[PDB]
């Protein structure tokens, strides 16, 4: 009970900032997550022993893929920590509990391939889950790990609080299917502008948590430029492997995934910032004003990709 995680001074300070990078020391990432749960949620949200066992089972179930790996899990949870800490009073006790766990679990057992690739391959997961294929898998893997002996971090919740938190997690993880983000953000855009947005309406809160999940998931575009740029290499290492596997099925991949079209990456990043990232953080900032630093960092990174295209880097 009296056992805090403490971080070295630089991390204790920088972890509070949206643009924090969790570092290359994998052994510190569990501690960083527990620290974040303790500050976000409280020192008795979870039994430390069960939480430590849950974290290590989650870690084991992330694969050694270039991008959709344990580092991404913890990175996405940190962005959620920063959103929750800057919006203290807007979220319930259950939501704070559920959303850091959701973020840690959101890409469990990811193979480095898109929903499209699984469907074109005719992977068994594409028969079991016809839409949001990997995301329904990720939720399935989260429930599996929660049911291991000694891994039920929610055991101290009442029956209906348990049902509510697993429902928060399920929706939060499904919302990371980027195919669903575009319509979710359009509806939030409409609701905010006509003034119908009501955070006491559960269907509206679901939508806002969905958008928070997209914001945390895309948060590589909200880091300092050297982090954004080096993370983009890991992102494209997966896309280009998927592209190779598309070519093995006799399907020309989209250019994003074709390593033969590396030269078009900077123009492809502009499209991504303009069509996905900037609109994501703009609507998030309209709904949750203290998340503005994410939008500001995203715009700075857009300007850096604009400089790459102008051959100034
Ligand atoms: C940082 C980042 N970038 C992404 O896509 C960039 C992207 N490159 C292209 C492209 C590249 C080369 C040639 C032609 C087109 C298109 N587009 C959308 C992401 N997609 C999902 N996530 C999480 C992403 N995060
Ligand atoms: Mg995912
Ligand atoms: Zn993700």
Task: In whole angstroms, give the CA distance from residue 205 to residue 230.
Answer: 34
Which residues, other chains included, contact 292 with Cβ-Cβ below 8 Å and sequence gap of 6+?
285
Nearest to 76 by CA among 203, 157, 175: 175
> Looking at the CA of 75, which ligand is closest?
3
Radius of gyration of the chain (CA): 19
Q: Find the length of the chain.
A: 313
The preferred substitution site among 71, 114, 235 for testing ligand 1, maximizing ligand atoms within 8 Å of CB, is 235
Residue 151 forms part of a structural domain: yes
CA-proximal residue: ligand 1, atom 24 (nearest): 218
Q: How far is the CA of 107 from the centre of ligand 2 (A)?
A: 5
Q: What is the DSSP string of 198-216?
A: -TTSHHHHHHHHHHHHHHH
Residue 235 beta carbon below 6 angstroms from any ligand 1 atom:
yes
Nearest to 193 by CA among 293, 91, 283, 288: 283
Asked whether residue 38 is marked as a ligand-binding residue, the answer is no
Q: How far is the CA of 256 from the centre of ligand 1 (A)?
A: 6
Q: Which of 68, 137, 138, 151 is catalytic?
A: 68
Residue 50 forms part of a structural domain: yes
Dihedral (Cα; 133, 134, 140, 141), 10-degree rounding: 160
Asked whether residue 137 is marked as a ligand-binding residue, the answer is no
Q: How far is the CA of 195 from the centre of ligand 3 (A)?
A: 31
Residue 221 beta carbon below 6 angstroms from any ligand 1 atom:
yes
Residue 291 forms part of a structural domain: yes
The residue segments making up the domain with residue 289 are 28-310
Residue 267 forms part of a structural domain: yes
CA-proximal residue: ligand 1, atom 18 (nearest): 272
Residue 269 beta carbon below 6 angstroms from any ligand 1 atom:
yes
> Looking at the CA of 175, which ligand is closest?
2
Inter-residue contact 37 to 96 (CB < 8 Å): no
Residue 11 forms part of a structural domain: no
**What is the torsional sign of CA 195, 196, 202, 208?**
negative
Q: Which atom of ligand 1 is nearest to the CA of 272?
A: 18
Q: Which atom of ligand 1 is nearest to the CA of 228?
A: 1
> Looking at the CA of 216, which ligand is closest?
3
Task: In whole angstroms, give the CA distance from residue 61 to residue 161.
Answer: 26
Domain count, the chain: 1
Task: In whole angstroms, give the CA distance from residue 14 to residue 202.
Answer: 33
Whether 123 sits among the annotated catalytic residues: the reply is no
Residue 9 forms part of a structural domain: no
Which residues, other chains included, contact 5 with Cβ-Cβ below 8 Å and sequence gap of 6+?
31, 34, 35, 38
Q: Tokens 């609080």 sit at which residue?
A: 161
Residue 121 forms part of a structural domain: yes
CATH code for position 112: 1.10.1300.10
Task: In whole angstroms, give the CA distance from residue 55 to residue 168.
Answer: 19
Residue 2 forms part of a structural domain: no
Asked whether residue 269 is marked as a ligand-binding residue, the answer is yes
């Amino acid at each position: 009970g009296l056992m805090q995680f403490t971080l070295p001074v630089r991390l204790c300070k920088e972890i509070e900032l949206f643009h924090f990078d969790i570092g290359p020391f994998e052994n510190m990432w569990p501690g960083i997550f527990v620290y974040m749960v303790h500050r976000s949620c409280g020192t008795s949200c979870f039994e430390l022993e069960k939480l430590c066992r849950f974290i290590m089972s989650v870690k084991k179930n992330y694969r050694r893929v270039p991008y959709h790996n344990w580092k991404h899990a913890v990175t996405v949870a940190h962005c959620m920590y920063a959103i929750l800490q800057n919006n203290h009073t807007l979220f319930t006790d259950l939501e704070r509990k559920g959303l850091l766990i959701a973020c840690l679990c959101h890409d469990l057992d990811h193979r480095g391939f898109s929903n499209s690739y699984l469907q074109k391959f005719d992977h068994p997961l594409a028969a079991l889950y016809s839409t949001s294929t990997m995301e329904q898998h990720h939720f399935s893997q989260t429930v599996s790990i929660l049911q291991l002996e000694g891994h039920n971090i929610f055991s101290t919740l009442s029956s209906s609080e348990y049902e509510q938190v697993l429902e928060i997690i399920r929706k939060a993880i499904i919302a990371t299917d980027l195919a669903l983000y575009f319509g979710n953000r359009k509806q939030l855009e409409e609701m905010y502008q006509t003034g119908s947005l009501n955070l006491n309406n559960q269907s509206h809160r679901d939508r806002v948590i969905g958008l928070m999940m997209t914001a945390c998931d895309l948060c590589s575009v909200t880091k300092l430029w050297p982090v954004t740029k080096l993370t983009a290499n890991d992102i494209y290492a997966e896309f280009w492997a998927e592209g190779d596997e598309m070519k093995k099925l006799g399907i020309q991949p989209i250019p994003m995934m074709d390593r033969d079209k590396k030269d078009e990456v900077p123009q492809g990043q502009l499209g991504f910032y303009n069509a996905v990232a900037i609109p994501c953080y703009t609507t998030l900032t309209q709904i949750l004003p203290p998340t503005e630093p994410l939008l500001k960092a995203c715009r700075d990174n857009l300007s850096q990709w604009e400089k790459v295209i102008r051959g100034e880097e």
